[PDB]
Amino acid sequence: VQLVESGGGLVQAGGSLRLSCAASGYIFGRNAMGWYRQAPGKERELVAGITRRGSITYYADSVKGRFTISRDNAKNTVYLQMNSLKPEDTAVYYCAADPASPAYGDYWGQGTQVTVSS
Amino acid sequence: VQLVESGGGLVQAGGSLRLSCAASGYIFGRNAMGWYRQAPGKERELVAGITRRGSITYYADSVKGRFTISRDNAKNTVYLQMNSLKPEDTAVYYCAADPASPAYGDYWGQGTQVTVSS
Amino acid sequence: AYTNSFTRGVYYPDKVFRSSVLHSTQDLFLPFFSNVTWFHAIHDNPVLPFNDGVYFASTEKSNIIRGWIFGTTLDSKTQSLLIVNNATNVVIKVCEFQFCNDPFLGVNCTFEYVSFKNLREFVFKNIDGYFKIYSKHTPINLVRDLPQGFSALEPLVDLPIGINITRFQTLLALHAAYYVGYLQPRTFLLKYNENGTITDAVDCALDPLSETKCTLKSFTVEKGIYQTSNFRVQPTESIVRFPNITNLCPFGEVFNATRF
Amino acid sequence: ASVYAWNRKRISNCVADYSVLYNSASFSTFKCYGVSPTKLNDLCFTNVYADSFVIRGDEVRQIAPGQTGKIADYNYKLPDDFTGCVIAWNSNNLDSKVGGNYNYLYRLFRKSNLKPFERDISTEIYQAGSTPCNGVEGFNCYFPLQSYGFQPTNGVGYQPYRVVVLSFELLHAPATVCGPKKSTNLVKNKCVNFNFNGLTGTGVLTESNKKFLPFQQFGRDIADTTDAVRDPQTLEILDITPCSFGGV
Amino acid sequence: SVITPGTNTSNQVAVLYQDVNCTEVNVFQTRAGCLIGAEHVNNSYECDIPIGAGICASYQTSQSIIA
Ligand SMILES: *[C@@H]1O[C@H](CO)[C@@H](O[C@@H]2O[C@H](CO)[C@@H](O)[C@H](O)[C@H]2NC(C)=O)[C@H](O)[C@H]1NC(C)=O
Ligand SMILES: *[C@@H]1O[C@H](CO)[C@@H](O[C@@H]2O[C@H](CO)[C@@H](O)[C@H](O)[C@H]2NC(C)=O)[C@H](O)[C@H]1NC(C)=O
Ligand SMILES: *[C@@H]1O[C@H](CO)[C@@H](O)[C@H](O)[C@H]1NC(C)=O
Ligand SMILES: *[C@@H]1O[C@H](CO)[C@@H](O)[C@H](O)[C@H]1NC(C)=O
Ligand SMILES: *[C@@H]1O[C@H](CO)[C@@H](O)[C@H](O)[C@H]1NC(C)=O
Ligand SMILES: *[C@@H]1O[C@H](CO)[C@@H](O)[C@H](O)[C@H]1NC(C)=O
Ligand SMILES: *[C@@H]1O[C@H](CO)[C@@H](O)[C@H](O)[C@H]1NC(C)=O
Ligand SMILES: *[C@@H]1O[C@H](CO)[C@@H](O)[C@H](O)[C@H]1NC(C)=O
Ligand SMILES: *[C@@H]1O[C@H](CO)[C@@H](O)[C@H](O)[C@H]1NC(C)=O
């Protein structure tokens, strides 16, 4: 619940958009964190994630050729750099633990809307 | 818990430093309030205190020759004027009830660091 | 090589003085008349399971058996318990010990404590973190087999270790014979004499006469018929039968609805 | 210690002053189960186990018998029949630090729940899907321990607390731990209220003429009641006779 | 139930299973249950240890329990 997202907005397909969030130590200390997205009419899915230990990253197949995820421990923040955005990437993006769940006391934040035009 | 401290900082030994805090009526209405300090490796101790009724003041022996404690009811605040500071006075200073304790529902605040150099 | 236990392995279960009484108790004891494994030291040192507790005994003239090791993997990764009789004392240590595959005595750590003709018997059990040792030393005149007769073991030491033990190995010095049995959770009727010494016992699950003796709280049984137990046929199989419903319940239609 | 790897120490062969803890105003909580917190100084124990760890303020309530939750199920568990005291206090000026203290760890997930007083210090990666992890984090693969990241400005539910649990073991075994009581002289052939190393009753004490084995502490009769005791200072055996009574 | 001479004579016993078939549990089936270990004979003697339904048992001549 102790998360803030930012960096959304409307862009034309191509170029890039930078998303970021900040976390309290409680969440930033979790084994791993990443970005999730939910498009209208769709289930929320994990887009990309980065671990706390080893900075291990992984990506969903649909974004492997264009997204980069990273973290900066100095400020307790997480970033997602989305390059070559296509209209298909329109969704609300959310910052959450890789094992995110109400079962662990997690909450979803407001998220931020990213819209990609023709 | 409804307390804010301020006025800390680094000074050279000698001269003086003014500490202050503000309290909600809940705490300001307590029989007495004062300042406590905790030096690294030491237990927290009461430095000085002032009562609500009669403005009775008292000081720890180690500071009797240089500290003055006072209160101003108009703003619900408490002040500690520390004169002739020595390196031995380096500690984190806290605002709390003279009978401060978790037993009474009290909490310690952030406190403020006062550092005194050669 | 195996031999009959001959009603040995009884020990005082607690530190309460009792006298002139027959007392019934449920604890880990060597079952009467089960057999134990007979090991020979002359022309071995196997690692044996500990199971639920160990009955150990040995017969000597030269006292070649010096001690024993208890533990799990015995690989220097976890705690192991080492007990050795040496010189004029007994030294007990619990450490991440490095063991030989065949440890012997030529002729970090967490815990430390310092205390044929001869028959020695011991009982080793782990309860609530304690390594409880009971023992007895009696004279013998028997070489070819395990001695018969009744004798109870007394508590020797009770060690506050907190160690997990699944296996053990003995320690012999090198230039006679020992037995290993296992304890089971069964009830005994113990007979205390006027000085509080246990002089006899009944293994309540040995046979129907023993059951009668335990039922009646007596070592002597009168002529007649006694009801001691209850026979029940046990189920051997299970049956599960349901109608041919393959349809799954539409929980998704209520649960995952677009509008509530 | 981190709660996932909680510490334990044994207390024995000592005088246990419990008033020093009970009347300390610094504790945020002091809850006893099975015993009143104010009668502790009058009781004897075989021994006392002191378990110790740091947890978050909102989960302090899980350190109790019968509770469930992430600490109760994966880090530290008390039995339903637990006898003992759970004592805790705020450590926001010690354990919390600027930027977050990530040294204190807890287990968020495991394959199965813990039994009372178990500890799990495994670093095995947890599989949460069908594909073997082989030690590597990624989709459906997670490391089970999380950091708390305690910070000075967290609200109270997110501040660290230091917790000490005193588990009291009671057995017929001679007490090795007793409170700060003073002894009196022994008297015989009088009706008295007695306490012998924690074993109490009312009766008349006389010298016995029976022999205890060297390890026996007390004896019992056919009714399983106390028959005799071994005096703890002079190792002699006394018989206990009920004080006379009858109808009128 | 256990049918026995006293222990001052013998440690041999016979056991009766009161409500069952001998096919379910020197075996004799009677109306009083399945009796195991006693030797049934077709002689007639005064009753010693009663079993039920006309049947008794005793210890006698080489000495064993008979029904
Ligand atoms: C004592 O240590 C042994 C290891 O020697 C533990 O045995 C393992 O138990 C797990 C289940 O928890 C099994 O999956 C393993 O296969 C067992 N290993 C072996 C070699 O048998 C045992 O559980 C420990 N006991 C206690 C009380 O901690
Ligand atoms: C409601 O929908 C969800 C998502 O479709 C179902 O949960 C499972 O979700 C995982 C992916 O996270 C899939 O791999 C599983 O196959 C889904 N389960 C099922 C049965 O489809 C959830 O079960 C649905 N709820 C109900 C009551 O049907
Ligand atoms: C004695 O040991 C043998 C070993 O082969 C085993 O088959 C037998 O069942 C054991 N008997 C008893 C009474 O323990
Ligand atoms: C002591 O324990 C640590 C783990 O906490 C281990 O790395 C070290 O090797 C152990 N020392 C010895 C002598 O076994
Ligand atoms: C009990 O001890 C006495 C000596 O005090 C001895 O004479 C007597 O025989 C002992 N009784 C038994 C059953 O050993
Ligand atoms: C206890 O102390 C008294 C007084 O010094 C002494 O006489 C007695 O023998 C001691 N008892 C034990 C068990 O140490
Ligand atoms: C029981 O046997 C003993 C001999 O061991 C004998 O003296 C006694 O009289 C017998 N009792 C009965 C009732 O037969
Ligand atoms: C035992 O089973 C047989 C059939 O095999 C039957 O004739 C007989 O009456 C049964 N006896 C009892 C006591 O159930
Ligand atoms: C039953 O009686 C016959 C004589 O009719 C006899 O030969 C047989 O041995 C007797 N059997 C038993 C078991 O008593």
Author numbering:
A (entry chain B), B (entry chain F): 2 to 119
C (entry chain C): 27 to 69, 80 to 143, 165 to 172, 186 to 245, 263 to 347
D (entry chain A): 348 to 595
E (entry chain C): 596 to 620, 641 to 676, 689 to 694
Passage from the reporting paper:
Coronavirus virions are bounded by a membrane that contains the homotrimeric transmembrane glycoprotein Spike, which is responsible for virus entry into the host cell. S1 binds the host cell receptor angiotensin-converting enzyme 2 (ACE2), whereas S2 catalyzes fusion of the viral and host cell membranes. The RBD is attached to the body of Spike by a flexible region and can exist in an inaccessible down state or an accessible up state. We isolated single-domain antibodies (nanobodies) that neutralize SARS-CoV-2 by screening a yeast surface-displayed library of >2 × 109 synthetic nanobody sequences for binders to the Spike ectodomain.
We further optimized the potency of Nb6 by selecting a saturation mutagenesis library targeting all three CDRs. Two rounds of selection identified high-affinity clones with two penetrant mutations: I27Y (Ile27→Tyr) in CDR1 and P105Y (Pro105→Tyr) in CDR3. We incorporated these mutations into Nb6 to generate matured Nb6 (mNb6), which binds with 500-fold increased affinity to SpikeS2P. mNb6 inhibits both pseudovirus and live SARS-CoV-2 infection with low nanomolar potency, a ~200-fold improvement compared with Nb6. Although the I27Y substitution optimizes local contacts between CDR1 in its original binding site on the RBD, the P105Y substitution leads to a marked rearrangement of CDR3 in mNb6. This conformational change yields a different set of contacts between mNb6 CDR3 and the adjacent RBD. The binding orientation of mNb6 is similar to that of Nb6, suggesting that multivalent design would likewise enhance binding affinity. Indeed, when mNb6-tri engages with Spike, it prevents ACE2 binding both by directly occluding the binding site and by locking the RBDs into an inactive conformation.
